[PDB]
Amino acid sequence: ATELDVDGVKVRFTNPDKVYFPKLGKNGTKGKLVEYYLSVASGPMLALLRDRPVHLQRFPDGIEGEEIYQKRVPQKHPDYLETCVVTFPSGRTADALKITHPSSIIWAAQMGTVTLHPWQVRCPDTEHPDELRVDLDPQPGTGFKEARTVACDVLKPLLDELGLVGYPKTSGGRGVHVFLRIKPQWDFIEVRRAGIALAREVERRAPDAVTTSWWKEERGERLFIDYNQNARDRTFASAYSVRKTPIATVSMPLSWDELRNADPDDYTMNTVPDLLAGRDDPWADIDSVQQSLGPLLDLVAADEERGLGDLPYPPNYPKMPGEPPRVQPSK
Structure with a gap:
């Protein structure tokens, strides 16, 4: 037309x-x-x-x-x-x-x-991601207040401790996404291992509120940090993408201060353009520093000394012919 x-x-x-x-x-x-x-x-x-x-x-x-x-x-x-x-x-x-x-x-x-x-x-x-993804995913019994709380009160101070800068957005559903911009010198395997160590450390600091359990039955009323989002070919809404929600919510990049009191329903394809007008891009500096996985990969080796290795991939997740054997789910 x-x-x-x-x-x-x-x-x-x-x-x-x-x-x-x-x-x-x-x-x-x-x-x-x-x-x-x-x-x-x-x-x-x-x-x-x-x-x-x-x-x-x-x-x-x-x-x-x-x-x-x-x-x-x-x-x-x-x-x-x-x-x-x-x-x-x-x-x-x-x-x-x-x-x-x-x-x-x-x-x-x-x-x-x-x-x-x-x-x-x-x-x-x-071959090499330039992004590490932290997916704070509420399980039944929890919602966006749990996600924003753990993101602002547990994850952000941990990133500060590691010398890392993260950039949060609403997923457009109930969850929160946090991006770490990284030098593209590690493959999907190592970026995912880094994300697992980060997820395990967030869980250790808030075990009543956060889980990495592969079995949903073991998760309870906690946030799941979906460490498998750093595997290949996993759904993940882009920043500013509209979502399949009744009110057409948008995955909205925010500053850490905005996230603390954010409501994901405030950001839709009908409200976002006016909200962006005159507002500083909270992710303005994301490409300014390509960060090293050094701090997180040290956490990986530390976890290996506790006897903590790889975690299972998603159910039935395909594998490549010469790929090293994966950790299978428990029980």
Whole structure:
């Protein structure tokens, strides 16, 4: 129906009045979603996603229709788009959409993408993450207040003690995501081991409130630090992505002070653009220092001296032919 000029690249856009979020009515159309992404796709969202391969969580007929989690780029796609070869945990490879320009994000939205799921690597170095992900995930009986509390009161002081800087965002669900920008010199195995040592230390400092137990039955009313989010090919909403919630919540980057009193429902595709106006980017300095895993990998070796090694991968998580044997779940 229309051709959009997205930072000098023309992008085809159709069906503006298709309803994606039925509780929002007029405010929950595909047009309002694309309008939201147009509002953020040329700002800090692009910088955070630049050169990353992404997977697309698509809802072509709204969040109550069928869901298509798209990893490989479709065999037929616009000429300008760039792709990057990603390696799945089986060893299989595929051409994934690479975010190189605001038009990349708007094309995704035109295809019904509600949520972008970026890899933790930058192309071309798909071997070494430049990001360690801390996923504070409330289990049944807990919610966002537990997540923000542990994030601000336990995790942030620990990072300060280690000489590390973390950047938090709401997940858009009940949880909190914290990013550590790191030098891309460690592979997925070592970044994940570093995240496990960090998770174990947060758990030691707040054992009544935090768990790393692989078995959900053993977790109780605690936050799970999902250490397996640093494995390959795990869903993880990008900063500024809209989520599959009834009110179209957005994964919102915040400062540590904002997070302390934050409510994730405050940030939606209808509220975020006005909230960003005049406000300093709390993640403005994230790329300013590429940090070493040195402190966390020392914690890993220390844990090995306590008799604490690797933790199990997610259930049925594929493995590569020559990959070292993994730790199996207990019982």
